[PDB]
Amino acid sequence: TNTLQVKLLSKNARMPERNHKTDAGYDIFSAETVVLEPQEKAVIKTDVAVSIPEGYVGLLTSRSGVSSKTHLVIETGKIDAGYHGNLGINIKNDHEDDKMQTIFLRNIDNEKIFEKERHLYKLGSYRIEKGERIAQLVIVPIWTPELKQVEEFESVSERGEKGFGSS
Amino acid sequence: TNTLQVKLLSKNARMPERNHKTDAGYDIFSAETVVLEPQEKAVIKTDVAVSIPEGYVGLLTSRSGVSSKTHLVIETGKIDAGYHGNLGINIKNDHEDDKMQTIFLRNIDNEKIFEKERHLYKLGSYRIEKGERIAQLVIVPIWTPELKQVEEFESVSERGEKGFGSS
Amino acid sequence: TNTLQVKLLSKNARMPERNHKTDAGYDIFSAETVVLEPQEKAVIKTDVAVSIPEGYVGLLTSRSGVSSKTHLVIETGKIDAGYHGNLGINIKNDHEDDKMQTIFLRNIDNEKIFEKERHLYKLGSYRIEKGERIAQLVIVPIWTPELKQVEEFESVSERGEKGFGSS
Ligand SMILES: O=c1ccn([C@H]2C[C@H](O)[C@@H](COP(=O)(O)O)O2)c(=O)[nH]1
Ligand SMILES: O=c1ccn([C@H]2C[C@H](O)[C@@H](COP(=O)(O)O)O2)c(=O)[nH]1
Ligand SMILES: O=c1ccn([C@H]2C[C@H](O)[C@@H](COP(=O)(O)O)O2)c(=O)[nH]1
Ligand SMILES: [Mg+2]
Ligand SMILES: [Mg+2]
């Protein structure tokens, strides 16, 4: 009732963790090491399942550090109540593909990764390490009413049909 | 009270549909056939209006299939209580514009569209078909208090001024 | 209790404003003038602090006008209850870097900015002016339960492990 069921699907999974006791979200960790080149897309596995109860939705979203410092973009996942599969981090390296080469991959803090064994990478490539903190899960109540088709609404609003307005 | 008013604005509109009875969102369908080239932006019409009541906001957001499989990016629309206009899907084909040509448009499952009448397209172009399911609407309660300007807050938090932290 | 504490951190700050009395969000204004070139990223300062109470999260998100009309992309910030720092607008000019030059910067309505003193800019560059309305803050209640690790969930759902489905 004030409890959320969490299922760890492999040895690579980490239990989600809340930094401060009043923060919104539970930190989410990668269960896989992946390199993403510029423009490359992936669904990164967490090997974590949850059982969000009816009346709620999970928002599987970015962290402020990773999104602001790198070109790694996470599309917010709407995690349905009842979904018991592996939580997937839906991600793109949105660094441009400019055809330049470099010796340095970048980590999720945008720091150059110095390797003893030197290799050539596409400029703007990132490595995500297993066990790194790349997303968070925030759970929010939802309203799911019956839909009633109408020809006209039962009240006239101040806003009306106005949208996509200027600044 | 557990009812949402929905107004269909044309013959091309489809009534929004919830897949599972505990899912968060109502599937939203395009009322238009559009081709989007790489980097092209549009507001796609649903020809659907709704009357979200005070105390709530609608989140007009992506589906997991379309966002993960294509370069089609939907910016989450915050649908105001009282807004009675046509719901617009705010979208970009974020495929890079690399100047390559192809015979194949892609659908929203990222499958090549085979045509009897062959044409040249920009590589990374998508067609969205009228009646296709490209977004969803999730409704969430909101807190809208009066704002009280202060010189200092009435409590000291654990978090304090910390933000945009590392991993 | 129906009150939100707001702290103005400088003379460049503006008090957040709700357009209609039933709208979801409080408009948020830039405290800085910045030019963003294609692919450039920034955290734009508002010089505004807030004290979101426990049980809520702030969503610092785009406006419909700016996102639909420009290539300026704002990543939704999850503003923690207790965070008392300067609200940062996490932004990218996602206009492609095509190496073309122009005399015209664009404003956030995507209008060309005519200058008496003519200068060369990168095509797709935007200027954000201090005091312009570029984001909004929507506050939403959250559920933050204790996590209970399990080997199997206490109910079988209709959805099950299904996710990232087709259209
Ligand atoms: O970023 C995401 C988005 C969705 N899902 C899963 C959980 C959702 O309940 C399910 C939705 O799938 P469709 O309804 O789009 O098929 O996919 C994820 O794991 N991560
Ligand atoms: O993706 C979106 C975003 C907004 N709107 C509409 C409904 C909102 O209430 C209204 C907000 O317009 P402004 O307040 O930004 O002018 O625009 C949409 O239809 N789709
Ligand atoms: O777009 C954003 C995202 C986050 N934050 C601040 C407020 C949050 O509480 C804090 C989170 O920082 P980390 O927990 O990611 O370190 O950063 C912003 O000001 N703007
Ligand atoms: Mg891009
Ligand atoms: Mg979002």
Residue numbers in the entry:
A (entry chain A), B (entry chain A), C (entry chain A): 2 to 168
The authors write:
We have recently proposed that the trimeric staphylococcal phage encoded dUTPases (Duts) are signaling molecules that act analogously to eukaryotic G-proteins, using dUTP as a second messenger. To initiate the SaPI cycle, a specific phage-encoded protein binds to the SaPI-encoded repressor Stl, acting as an antirepressor. Both the trimeric and the dimeric phage-encoded Dut proteins are the antirepressor proteins for a subset of SaPIs, including SaPIbov1, SaPIbov5 or SaPIov1 (8–10). However, our results analyzing the Dut protein from phage 80α (Dut80α) revealed that motif VI is essential for interaction with the SaPI-encoded Stl repressor, determining the affinity with which the Dut proteins bind to the Stl repressor.
We thought that the differential effect of each nucleotide could be related to the mechanism of Stl binding and we tried to clarify this ambiguity using two complementary strategies: first, we solved the structure of the Dut80α bound to dUMP; next, we analyzed the formation of the Stl:Dut complex in the presence of dUMP. Remarkably, the structure of the Dut80αWT bound to the dUMP showed that motif V was ordered over the active site. Comparison with the structure of Dut80α bound to dUPNPP shows a slight but evident difference in the conformation of motif V, that affects the last four C-terminal residues. This partially conserved region (GSSGV) of the C-terminal motif V, which is involved in γP recognition and enzyme activity, adopts an alternative conformation in the presence of dUMP, approaching motif VI. The reported fast posthydrolysis release of dUTP products, pyrophosphate and dUMP, in Duts would also be favored by the weaker dUMP stabilization of motif V over the active center as is reflected by the B-factors increment of this region (30% higher for motif V than for Dut main body) and the absence of density for the final two residues on dUMP-bound Dut80α. Interestingly, the dUMP-induced motif V conformation was similar to one of our previously characterized Dut80α mutants, in this case the Dut80α D81A D110C S168C (in short Dut80αD81A C-C). And in agreement with the results obtained by Szabo et al. with Dutϕ11 (13), the dUMP does not interfere with the formation of the Stl:Dut80α complex. In summary, while the crystallographic data show that dUMP induces conformational changes in the C-terminal part of motif V, the affinity of the Dut:Stl complex is not increased in the presence of this nucleotide, suggesting that this change neither favors nor hampers the interaction with the repressor. Indeed, the analyzed motif IV residues are in close vicinity of the pyrophosphate and C- terminal part of motif V, the two elements that show changes (the first is absent and the second alter its conformation), depending on whether it is the dUMP or the dUTP that is bound to the enzyme.
